[PDB]
Amino acid sequence: XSLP
């Protein structure tokens, strides 16, 4: 996987 997730944003990150």
Added chain:
Amino acid sequence: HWGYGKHNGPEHWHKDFPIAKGERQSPVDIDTHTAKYDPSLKPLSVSYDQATSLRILNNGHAFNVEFDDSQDKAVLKGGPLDGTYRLIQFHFHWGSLDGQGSEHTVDKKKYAAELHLVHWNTKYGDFGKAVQQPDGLAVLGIFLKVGSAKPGLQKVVDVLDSIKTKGKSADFTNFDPRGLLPESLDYWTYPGSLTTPPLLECVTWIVLKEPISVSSEQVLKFRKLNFNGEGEPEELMVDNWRPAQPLKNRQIKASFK
């Protein structure tokens, strides 16, 4: 709010990430007698000579050593892979005791820890796009057993005091990940998933047969990290591994006889 506790651990993940019960979840038990030698598999090509490490981060679940992946500096190719996969980060999973900690198992044997070198397929341009594709990622998994120290790990061990709690990071330049490899690149391979949420089914797993040895003192320092943030109650970062998942309709192939 997923994690590794009684209340938010692997058996709860399916409620927010239903793919947890999917057809190609990781890790798995590697049954060495059932794995088929595949003479068509190529030697792994690990090209880490120009690797640029940047930073180390405690993300509340593990610590990640991050790399510059803006160019083909540290790449994986060959083995079962088509094309070029760029190293983005490595991290470990480990136990509270030396008898547990690995995610993959070998004939139901659990190792003390497991190193994941995470790479993404350059044909998809960025990591976020790659995780949406069935051939998006290649993760090189390496088992850790407790015995002799691994000299190439000590620079990692020595920085952990500076990132004890969730959200802390430290500069971590000029680290050479070649110092974490075993002698042999003999491997097993199968199609699987991320082993943490979001559990996306985007990984070609490459698990080395030969473990590395680390010392009791090195792994003790992993177990002093915290899952919690600074000025929250201390919860030691241990047992951050997902158990083996059903193999379902998959074949594990061996590079070696």
